[PDB]
């Protein structure tokens, strides 16, 4: 309206933007049955010390 | 603005470049000063609106955005942008 620079009183369009900066995130992963890696130890039963 | 008439009464065709400025036009009864406060005043086009600006003598305006102080006047302007 007149109080803020407009000729007519009524609704006006307004838009506001702010830069968004992520500071801490989390991530979810998908584990495929394949590409899984098993570690196996094969030890000789000798009794050595 | 273009000054014409509507049934003997003065009529103002107001263009976009007049938004915010006092509208003055001479009349037998002295100089008339209409005040246009229409927020939606835009470019003159097909979408016009036309209505009356009442005479207001020492009275505060209420529920209106157009008024003159010497002789009631009709006003017309477009809303396009």
The string of DSSP letters for B33-61 reads EEEE--BT--EEEEEEEEEEE-B-SS---
Length in residues, chain A = 49
Query: Do A10 and B19 count as a contact with CB atoms less than 8 A apart?
Result: no
- Say what the resolution is, in angstroms: 9.8
B36 touches chain A (CB under 8 A): yes
Query: How far is residue B9's CA from residue B3's CA, in Å, rounded to a whole number?
Result: 11
A48-to-A40, A41, A42, A45 alpha-carbon distances in Å: 21, 17, 15, 8
3-class secondary structure, B17: helix
Nearest CA in chain B to A2: B37
Partners of residue B39 in chain A, C-beta under 8 Å? 1-2, 6-10, 12
B1-to-A17, B9, B11, B77 alpha-carbon distances in Å: 39, 16, 10, 10
Query: How far is residue B64's CA from residue B14's CA, in Å, rounded to a whole number?
Result: 17
Query: How far is residue B22's CA from residue B53's CA, in Å, rounded to a whole number?
Result: 13
The residues near A23 (Cβ < 8 Å, ≥ 6 apart) are: none
Helix (H) or strand (E) holding B27: strand B23-27
Experimental method: cryo-EM
CA of residue A38 relative to chain centroid, distance: 29
Phi/psi at A2 (5° precision): -60, -35
Query: Do B41 and A9 count as a contact with CB atoms less than 8 A apart?
Result: no
């Amino acid at each position: 309206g007149w109080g803020n620079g407009c000729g007519l009183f009524g609704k006006g369009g307004i838009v506001t933007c702010a830069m968004f900066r992520c500071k801490k995130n989390m991530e979810g992963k998908v584990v495929q049955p394949e590409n899984l890696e098993y570690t196996i130890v094969i030890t000789p039963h000798s009794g050595e010390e | 603005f273009h000054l014409t008439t509507r049934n003997g009464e003065p009529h103002m065709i107001v263009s976009r470049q007049e938004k915010g400025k006092s509208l003055l036009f001479k009349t037998e009864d002295g100089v008339n000063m209409c005040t246009l406060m229409a927020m939606d005043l835009g470019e003159l086009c097909e979408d016009t609106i036309t209505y009356k600006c009442p005479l207001l003598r020492q009275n505060e305006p209420e529920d209106i955005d157009c008024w003159c102080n010497s002789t009631s006047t009709w006003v017309t302007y477009g809303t396009c942008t």
